[model samples]
Target chain A: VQEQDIETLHGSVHVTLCGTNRPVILTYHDIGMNHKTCYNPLFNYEDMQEITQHFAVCHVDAPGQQDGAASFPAGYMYPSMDQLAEMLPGVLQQFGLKSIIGMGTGAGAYILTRFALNNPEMVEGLVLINVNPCTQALPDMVVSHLFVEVVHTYRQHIVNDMNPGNLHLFINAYNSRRDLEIERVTLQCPALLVVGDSSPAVDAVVECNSKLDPTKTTLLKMADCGGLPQISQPAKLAEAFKYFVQGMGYMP
Target chain B: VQEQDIETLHGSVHVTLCGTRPVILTYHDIGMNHKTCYNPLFNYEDMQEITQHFAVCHVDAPGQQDGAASFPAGYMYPSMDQLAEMLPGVLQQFGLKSIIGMGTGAGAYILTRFALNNPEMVEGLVLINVNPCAQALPDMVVSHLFGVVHTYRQHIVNDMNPGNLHLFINAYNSRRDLEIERPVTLQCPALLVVGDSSPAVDAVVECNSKLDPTKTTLLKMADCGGLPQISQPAKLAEAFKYFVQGMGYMP
Candidate 1:
């Protein structure tokens, strides 16, 4: 894995590049995780090697959100969701990528979508997981990443060990996120919306599906899964991804 | 639009025979007409590619088609076994000896019975939202739970006569257990399909468990609810095409 700190307009975003092939897969970590913590289980899964080996991968970390990072300067202005979306271009330009298929979860999904909506030509397809496009009235009480729903170890990793100052900024951006304007504009690419049946985000994903151009969208509901399908149900998610990418004229 | 009034022992059956020689027969869910349940799916572009090789014979249960004469007061529908018996007459009417059959809900239960009884006559099977077990209130629960699907329910609420529907209830209630050990289950290759959100998922999964693994392929569709043909025909057609090919038919 070749790691780089790309300077985007919003902030310096962390990116870990891997694989050796065509049809690039761009990944963004959900809140409460860095790239490795969010995607390794699925990407590094035994069954996923066939697919992972065929496509080059670029894992983008939200600003100040990589596994280990220096805390932001005192009185640092945090990047909002839109700023995060705008920040993605630098990664593409720096890497000389003309197009990619994105797999984003939660907050990362929203950012990737915002980027796709703005730069449609560069995005060939998408796999959005546990994505809630509409702004939260900031949940019913409290949350962080903002993870109101996550497994214990990862939750502990975020809450106890991570830098609270930087975490608060990223979490604030996610909670105050604006709607993706998805109702008026759907992603003009073959997209797969995956959500676990057990996730509270089911309605959120279902609602997103209802609005997206159905001709271009396929919704995959993984059973016996939670908010984290990539982590919990890697095998099924991997199978679904093979079909999803195959449907997009990519290698199965 | 070749509509035939097929005469069965119980009543007049409406059969729409389209396309050609090699046949693929379809049966509708309870409270839904054959045309309402299967037409859009059969007419789908991807599905059209599959049908190009085989003729589609859409069979409607008595009193289950449009413009049907209502049953007299206190009329009783045929039991599930009797319903399976009615299908042979359909084959005879068309001079068809063997078939690749597809059915949904109660229709699946009946078609599955037909395959089990006349194994040599059925080449392959596609059972959608199928329940092999007979529950006292099976038909009603399926019809009620599917009410959230407005387009499908509108047909049930408007066109399906309650008296006739009530009679079909007994057909399901009166069904005998399809014990695989009822000495030799379905010997033909079969595809069991259902929406993940289907009220019949448990039954469909159970049916899959009981069937011969070498002869079965269970397709659990993600968003199809109670019906794959209605909500997700493209995916259904895609899978259906593969199934048809798997059996060396429509190749």
Candidate 2:
């Protein structure tokens, strides 16, 4: 695995790339977290490793979101969620990547969905968890999908691991995020939408399933699993991912 | 690699057995071949853990495999009793004395029929979406539970050879009721399971009432519509693993 700073049209973003093969597993992190804090346990799971070992696992950090980041310049303007979505094309071009199996949670899911909507040809599939496309109705947006167990651990990490000032801007941008305009067009790639039965965003996630092409979408509502389906139910999530990929005529 | 085409009194039936010892024999429901019906459940990654310790024999009903040639117009398909009789030939051909039976729907009826005829030959049974009565439910009721619709509202109608399926349906529709002795103390146990929304739920519940409670266990899975194998295979595999463990098969 190698880490590189890719300068996109909007701004430079940190990227950690591994596997460097044909198909890429592109991922982004939710609010109050970075790529490592979000995806490490999920991608490192035994079953997830079984799938990840087959393709490149690329973790993309939002602007100024990587650990130990220098405080931004006096008047630095962080990118909007759409601008963040626009940044992915540069990451793809820098790596000479063809297509990706995009995976994300919450805010990251929204970003990845926008990227796929704009660049359908560059994505093979998507696995989104607790994804809320219409941010207009959401009030407690920062408390995305924190369950009882993971909430404490995540809070500690947010205070200790991430630079608070940088995270605030990202969270603000995410909260002020626009409705994805998903009602206008549906995603072309095959998608697997996941949500914990107990999550606050289950209804939004369920509604998102209807917006996506039904024939190309699979809605997975895992019971008793908390908001973080990726981490809380890694084994089942990995299994579903394999089946989702299988349905797409890959790695069967 | 271990699939065998065994000739029985009725005709040639196909059997694919995985692993070895403490055999778990599976039979398919109507409108579905063995692979389509049970693949997701038995091939589940979780199932890989339990299946390693036991043998899963997947049996395909005669004339039911993909791309099978049509049954001759003059030929008559085997009746339900004859179908149940054919399984002993499967056991005998494989040099086995008894089995742990796992079957679905019409296949469940067949396994139960086999168990009644040869109790010593059945060590245990796991019946999924089963209707034990001789009285047949509507054909659409059975198809709706298979959960394969759309290029397919029905699986059997779209996938199977239409003429041969009707004959098989006739066989299933004309099944004989099982004579399970209610009070008899049995050495073998029976696992009764059905999806929450399956049409067979009432049948499975009523079937449970007829069986000896001391030896029977009922599992009704929720949020799973019709086919638990298709929608909730991991859950099914986990339940199967525990049930097999309860039987003291794989420690």
Candidate 3:
């Protein structure tokens, strides 16, 4: 457990960049909100620790965004890209680095893209996993309004946005929106875009990638699986990350 | 008619830098060397008139090392990325300016991407009929081996390239060899990518863009007819030069 403050105008903002840093590999959590976020059995941290050496992970929380709220503040969603930016600098300073690599999925990708674009120079590289951007604004349209409605009533107390209990809910929300759509990109750094063949979002991302410079961008398609390193075959996901980052001059 | 100095170098380079002001767009061409080496179609008088109104469209020429005879003379094949890199200086000098949008087939998509990646500063944009990059290379490849084989044997007469001709013929000679082989793309720009639909690469390159990215990079297809711009209905070709000068952003 580590404590740090990412300075913002909202009086010194505090955030916990947590997750076991194995062999110094840090994977920032997009909207984990707090340090004691639960680890999904499917994500298998023990297995990850066995295979990898180090990690530098961080759990992000939006400003004044309370956990397990009935709904995020008004029209403003709890998962705010702007809020993440306000906090990243202090996170970087605490982590003892000027540059870092970030990885994310779905809403995470949306956040990461915004983060990277805003701080193109802050993060040296990024690996976006199963990101299906905000294809349609309404979250209800994504997983279906009925589904969100049911979860709100039957499982209302269960999901509090960024609470540890909602990790599976977070993963579910992420899985439902896995369509790939990137045509053109020019980040000046290499990005690895991974997707599943069965995922409906593949073509969108493929078309979008066409708009990006081929020199620094690549797309990889995985077969028949929800977008998770474990379900996508944990070993392969980690290996893909290993090889991609290595190519970026991160490792020997 | 611009005169070429043939007696000196194997071929005089047409490294058109465009406009007397400074460089806006600088790409080149390596056509057969002669004292007067203008495309007749892209005459200095016509080109100069356009540059006066918009940005100059420079066409570069590779050195003796750029072509068949100069293959071994240290002239390297320019990558798509290399060509794009060459555009930034010309772009930077313009400030509020954006690439007015020239290029056809693969050239369009590639440069369009450059414009998009830096959209905040982009000016008047134009996408003349073009193939997206993915499909462009394949189309260029197939046309080279089969579609344009007859054209090569005719218009591009050269006894000096017996070796290269044999290489082409030999590749076409065996179905197995052709089946097993593929063109290695330099992967430079997206402009090379053309979609695989017709009437775009077929009709005068003016109205519509037909091909997708994947089908554009064809290495084993034939050129159905002459290049759209060259095949008479050269309106898009004309519009291409005009758009580059002012279509997208230049005031």
Candidate 4:
């Protein structure tokens, strides 16, 4: 399918309702590094098959990377907030989804955060895992720390660099500029920023808590975990997922 | 007043005309470079008197130069062609100007052309003084020849450039790039391009005829017998005013 093309996938995707008839869950894969279609580290085949009754899961591969980022399997070079907004309407209709819990990683957070803001009515809650703001919205402080400014000033068009480690150079360039406070403020929906105390991003979670609407926001901190492992370890992330849906009154 | 602030003037700035009157003459100064608040050569003292007999006009200096180009003593910038169309209502109130014979110099022709296209009911005819529309439409080319291309093309700005010199550069540039053939097909309402046969602009008068409608377009050439003298001769220039006012039913 073309980058902005809209068509039904018929039955290529999976959707299920959790215990007590919870609101539908719609999961999107992170682009560039890992997409959920064929390779989802968070999805334990044995555990997922065993706990089929615990939660309804709708797993989707990030569309921009499907063909090696050139088509499917590849990932977007850079997509705009408006482009991601266009994709949400289709997913909403496919699952009859009213609210979403995004388990987006890295660049995937850019898509999730932007889509949630654009489709606030369809979102009951959002679970952002190591999410970052859209590149355009990255505050000045974050841009400085993430080295986004350094790349643009010192290097031009670094997206297609062929060196094996060049991608991390871009990732470091991006990570250095992450502004959790600003991203948290923009993440207005009922959201949870979960990370382990030993994780490099634990500070990001604190900043996220401070940035969110204080009256509505709460943070859940664990010890010695990094990145999406906070979600993958023993399927503990599943409890956080159950807590969110229940908080929204969709589950008992 | 601020640039976009709407305020009423102390006196009535109205163009009055009886119901039977037939035209509304209007002109606009598109962007403010020349003949705006103080176009270097304009005798504004003359405009106050001239506008009394004529329903005089000019465009609001565009946003860039708005500070100096507000509603003038006699001439008021009517913003757009749409506003100019409603002139008859005010003409009925003050100057009773029914029929309009439009005239402009240089970039001022831009707004007049717009008026002709949108308010043909009010613009019964037009007189472009040292102004030519055939060459003015394409904004890119016009900006280039006029030395007005600033944002993308930066080389034109000069610190000590005099207003008159800038205006001349602009006119000279536009004349050089005008499409002579395309302008001839315009639905010209009694037009004339004046130049001495010996002047460099002699060819312009000939080109002007090409843009005029077959019957409405007129080319009037006179010879003052020599070069530069024939170009700016005091008596020859005054004759142009008589020639233009004679073309239409001016109130």
Candidate 5:
């Protein structure tokens, strides 16, 4: 893995690039988890290596979220969703990349959806896992929600890093900005919504899928799985991502 | 003192805004707390004559240097470019339409960059001991490092983490591109101040020469050192008050 810090107009984002000079798959992580932990399972999967070998894969850690960089200074605010969406192009520019197939999880999904809508030409396809259509404050569905469990797990990560203030910023970033309907209605790229069967985000993902053009959007439910299918069912997630990329003519 | 936190793209910045009239956003130097650096000038007996006519907002830099809060072990200090990028957001968050920026030392350079990036958001600037260029001389760095190391022995360090030294060093190394372009981009009226006895005076003079002479004013404080607020608060306050009045920010 070639790791580098790409300095953008907003700040430097840490990116890990791998594979040959091929079409790129730009992946982003959910809040609370940095790049190292968020995509570890998928990258470690044996079958995932085949997909990586065919295409250049780039994983980005959100600004200030590099593995060792645990906490923001006191009174530091994570960028809002809209701001991050605007800043996404700068990251691409820094890497000298023109476009890519986008992959994101949870909050990362929300960010990339905004990104795709804002810069449609830059994204050929999207693989959004456990995607939530609306902001955390306006949850429409309550199907098998792991809100409490997820928060508890995220809190443990924060405590382990010994940065309690990060919990506040994490929750704030997750819950702020309830205006994803515009992106949902306007997004034109071919998209796949991947969610575990027992995941709390299923209803929201379905809502997002419903808003997209039915011909272009596909919703896949992972059976016998809960939240975070990338970790629980890495092989299936990798297969689905590769298939979508190939369908978009990004790979063979 | 009214304390509040204004959220920016990178993180929240702590600020204390006093009064309510024509706004003046103040960024204090790194070594001293915002209160220590600004209160003397704002609270001076004669200064009170003009203080009532303007609002002063003092910003504390990130990393909890001045009783703010401690950062995690791995917390990266925002680079100069990164910190400047957040200023527009800070203004929007605070509902400030436009402000007169007053900053000292490192804070002065940050505001200068902010003015360059968001010219519309700034009405004017009072830059104290600012070096508009970015380059570190090795001897100067070593001398500064030695001073910090020596002070640490007396338990007098404001920023305890050695990790932050890289941040100070990075500020000097990151923005060579801004050197010529930034000063020209600062379209607003400016007041550049440098203490005669301070080592930064030469750089400040260099910055003054590069700025548009018609719009910029330079003030040289006599019998003062690096921090005029501590040594000659009255003179600094008088100059600031007159500059504000001349700019028509105060009547």
Candidate 6:
């Protein structure tokens, strides 16, 4: 595991790289979980060792996600999804990754999808797990509910030994509403949509899949898992991922 | 004549402290100058009621103010935790055993974090337009602020770079836990003030209930929006004077 901080116009983004080859696999984690928790399982899985050995893999931890990252100053504004998507080219340019196969979960998936949609010529493929495509506003009640909602969230964070920043990032990400319809309709790269049968995101992912080019899209479902199949069923998800990458003709 | 670089085990912060007794330390929100927003409060007649009783010191986030150095290449913005951690150094440098904090918006959030981190150093807080819960601001507003900093940078001949504006965006939504978990237990007396027409007023109203009832007070200013310090400084100063005197910082 090699850790590197790549400087961008925004700030220095922390990235961890593994393996050594092109058509690099860039992974991003869902909010609440950093790259280590989400992608480390796949590397530890014996079945994933073959692909892990062959492809150059990198995990980019969003702005504050890195362990011991300094606090951003007051009045700093976090980037909207569009701005963040626009920033990806600079991050990729810093990393010298001209071509990429993106694997992102939840919010990470949305970011990579946005990046792929905006810069189709650069992305070779994308694997999006538990992706939600809704662009509707959340209820006013739901937004107001977070003040009280945060206490229970704090207790859970205590029990799980997670930091409070995770809950904040999760809520912010939850509140974001990005319209992926045009991106879905126009995406040129092949895509893999992974859904957990028990996940709340099932309907959204199914709808997202239906909007894609069927010939270039594959829908895979893993049984007996919730939203985070990467953590609960990394082996099964990786097996599917290996086949997907191989099908893209980037087999190692 | 005193400027110190505070070394918190995490990183370095720059602070400039002046004035005397009944010390008041202030933090300003993003996109606005501390002097531009705060000087009005002191200039007003109502401000005399408080300025006579207290000395004010303002802390600027690096690269945000005049004479501050623009961040060199590869500078990482401090997280809220890091910002809070840096406060003890400010206290140590100035020998300020206690202080009254007056903060606005993101400044309020940072001061709240500072209070939570150093309970003994903070005697009271005047938080203007602060939302205690973590929720996203409208994207339109975020985009506009980004452009504001960009234009501000181009207009200035100083070292105040535009990257700080980008850093400001990252800082706003960066920490939810710092805002949510600590307010429930703040030991200092607090004054919650917001413009009656501001989008944040309801949240500030909602937040008042979550704080310790004995230590919290709410003040709403009419005809003003998010920035009361800039728009309604007289009323804001009057409210602060009352809150500070009520807390026994001034009689």
The lDDT leader among the candidates is 1
Q: What is the C-alpha RMSD of each candidate to the true structure, in Å?
A: 24.7, 24.9, 14.8, 23.4, 16.1, 13.3
**TM-score attained by model 5:** 0.50
List TM-score per model, in order: 0.47, 0.48, 0.38, 0.36, 0.50, 0.46
Q: Which stretches of candidate 2 lie over 4 Å from their true place?
A: A135-145, B1-251
- Model 1 complex DockQ against the native: 0.01
Cα deviation of B146 in candidate 5 (Å)?
Answer: 14
lDDT measured at residue A229 in model 2 versus the true structure, 0 to 100: 82
Model 4 has an lDDT value of 0.39
Among all windows of 10 consecutive residues in model 3 chain A, the one with the lowest summed lDDT is A33-42
- lDDT tens digits by residue: candidate 5, B1-251: 57888766456777886775457888865444476567878888768866777777877776434444556665655666556666765666566768889888778888987786556668899998787775223334434311222332222244433335445455545543343333334688889988876778888888887788778888888876656776788888788778777777553
Clashes of each: 1, 0, 81, 44, 5, 13
Residues B23-121, model 3: lDDT tens digits: 243231122211111243344343545546543544332331113353343333333332332343334333424444344433343354444333323
- How would you encode candidate 6's per-residue C-alpha lDDT over A114-204 as one tens digit per residue? 7786566669999998877664222332223311553354344333443444335444744564556543435688899998777767887
Q: What local distance difference test score does each model get?
A: 0.77, 0.76, 0.40, 0.39, 0.69, 0.67
Put down candidate 4 lDDT per residue, A1-252, tens digits, no spaces: 112223321112222223214454556544333243222444554444333355555555443333333321233232222233335545666546556666555554555655565445556667666555523322232223322343353123223321223233334434433232243325556776666656655665565566667555667776545544433363566556556666766542
Q: Judged by DockQ cut-offs, is candidate 3 incorrect, acceptable, medium or high? A: incorrect
DockQ-derived CAPRI band for the predicted complex in model 4: incorrect
- Model 2 C-alpha lDDT per residue in residues A97-206, reported as the tens digit of each score: 77888998888899999778756777998989789987331213345545566666766666666676787688787877767656425687888899998777888898
- The positional error of residue B248 in candidate 4, measured at the CA in angstroms, is 38
i-RMS, each model, one decimal = 29.9, 30.5, 17.0, 23.3, 13.3, 15.3
**lDDT of the structure predicted as candidate 2:** 0.76
